[PDB]
Design a protein around this ligand. Structure first.
Ligand SMILES: [Cl-]
Length: 505
């Protein structure tokens, strides 16, 4: 750990580290708005088929109320309202006499919606759903779009992982900011949903590069004693951005203006990120010690206070920089950690992307999700001060699964209690995630802590990709996604009890 001593000698607690954290707070504040945008920009408004008798103003007989025309023009659907995707071929005038038994019409009188849809614009002025008619049959493309975005983060993280050995961390950060900004603003001009999804993929690829460069540069320029505090501050910045998205969507409500508000700040952040210095340690490993020493002298000058000694002192640590699968105890602990992290991230992203189903007011729910993650972190710290890691992890993940199942049990009325259970489940996943982040570091020794974290992270992003894809199944079985998230959360809590060891703590 000789580079940490060099950073201490360079002033590991100076003005530079604060300015660096603030500079990285800007993208961590803005990333949730881009990542979770589709909860608002792809909100499904109330909709029905266009029908000549109801929607062509020249055919509206002056003597009928719009409610009567709706009743005679659209059959009741499974839920308490007009059926969203089908109309009668001819107006069923027989359906207006109050003495007619409600079964006088057949399914044979219905057809799929052929002439498109008329959307209620009272709640949302425009969505991508209303732009490309993604309902009843095409409803799977929204969570598919979110899944494509998560796949963009996965592929980006992999490709940028490989490219990070050759290419530098400052220009990669700048390029990824520019790429995300350009692709994000370009999405408003997409003529087809396919072009939209492709631009979202390219945006997520850039976001993946943002995540990699920000975390790597931050850890590499923060001393080990401060890494945990800095990571906590970054988590709080992420949570502030998550809360701010609810207010931003409340402020504009137009998907195009919201997309601009999410994408243009990454244009502004790219130039500031261009001001940032490159990693001196990376420069050393690449065999560029003169530039690394120049960067150390620049940082030490900015924080307000010799050659050959630096590179010689860290030679062995750079030089030093399998048993996990052959050895049965490690095999089983590894497998357990992959299943738990996979099931956790599947349920976390299922919940965060399921916003329109969890509450009628998605803006309040998003704000509460940020507030309760903050509250969750404060109590995770309290729980860790009183209790142990395994019990809190298992209990929190079980409470999250129970909260999802309870949400499935809540009638549409009493919206506040449904919001309470959804917010509780989100908070529980926030605590479980922070516990898991600590517990991974405590369970694995450094050579395999590092080997394990790469595979765990890639399996977790696979989980993140699988979340919205399971959410796609709602069109056939509406109760299946939250049921799955509940049962998988409970089952992985059982995995924790049976398969993870008790530790010294
Ligand atoms: Cl990632």
């Amino acid at each position: 750990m000789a580079f940490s001593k060099l950073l201490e000698q360079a002033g590991g607690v100076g003005l530079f580290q604060t300015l660096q954290v603030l500079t990285f707070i800007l993208p961590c504040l803005m990333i949730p708005s881009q990542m979770l945008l589709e909860n608002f920009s792809a909100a499904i408004p109330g909709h029905r088929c266009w029908t000549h008798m109801l929607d062509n103003g020249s055919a509206v007989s002056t003597n009928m109320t719009p409610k009567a025309l709706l009743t005679i023009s659209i059959p009741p659907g499974p839920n308490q309202g007009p059926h969203q995707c089908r109309r009668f071929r001819q107006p069923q005038w027989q359906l207006l006499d109050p003495n007619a038994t409600a079964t006088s019409w057949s399914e044979a009188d219905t057809e799929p919606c052929v002439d498109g849809w008329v959307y209620d614009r009272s709640v949302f002025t425009s969505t991508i759903v209303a732009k490309w008619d993604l309902v009843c049959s095409s409803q799977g493309l929204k969570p598919l779009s979110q899944s494509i975005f998560m796949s963009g983060i996965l592929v980006g993280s992999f490709i940028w992982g490989l490219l990070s050995y050759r290419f530098g961390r400052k220009p990669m950060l700048s390029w990824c900011c520019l790429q995300l900004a350009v692709a994000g603003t370009s999405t408003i001009f997409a003529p087809t949903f396919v072009i939209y999804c492709g631009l979202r993929f390219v945006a997520a690829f850039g976001m993946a590069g943002i995540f990699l460069s920000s975390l790597t540069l931050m850890v590499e320029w923060t001393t080990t004693s401060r890494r945990a505090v800095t990571m906590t501050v970054v988590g709080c910045a992420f949570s502030a951005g998550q809360a701010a998205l609810g207010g931003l969507a409340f402020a504009l409500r137009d998907w195009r203006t919201l997309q601009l508000a999410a994408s243009v700040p990454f244009f502004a952040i790219s130039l500031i990120s261009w001001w940032l210095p490159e990693s001196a340690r990376w420069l050393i490993i690449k065999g560029k010690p003169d530039q690394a020493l120049q960067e150390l002298r620049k940082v030490a000058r900015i924080n307000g206070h010799t050659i050959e000694v630096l590179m010689s002192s860290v030679k062995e640590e750079v030089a030093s920089a399998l048993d996990l699968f052959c050895v049965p105890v490690l095999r089983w602990r590894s497998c357990a950690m992959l299943v738990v992290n996979f099931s956790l991230l599947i349920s976390y992203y299922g919940l965060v992307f399921d916003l329109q189903s969890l509450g009628r007011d998605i803006f309040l729910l998003q704000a509460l999700f940020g507030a309760v993650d903050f509250l969750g972190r404060a109590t995770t710290a309290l729980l860790l001060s009183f209790l142990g890691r395994r019990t809190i992890q298992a209990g929190s993940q079980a409470m999250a699964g129970l909260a999802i199942l309870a949400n499935m049990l809540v009638p549409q009325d009493l919206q506040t209690l449904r919001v309470v259970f959804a917010v509780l489940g989100k908070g529980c996943f926030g605590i479980s995630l922070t516990c898991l982040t600590i517990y991974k570091a405590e369970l694995f020794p450094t050579p395999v802590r590092m080997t394990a974290d790469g595979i765990l992270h890639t399996v977790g992003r696979l989980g993140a990709m699988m979340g919205p894809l399971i959410l796609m199944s709602r069109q056939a079985l509406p109760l299946l996604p939250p049921l799955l998230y509940g049962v998988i959360s409970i089952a992985s809590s059982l995995v924790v009890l049976f398969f993870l060891p008790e530790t010294q703590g």
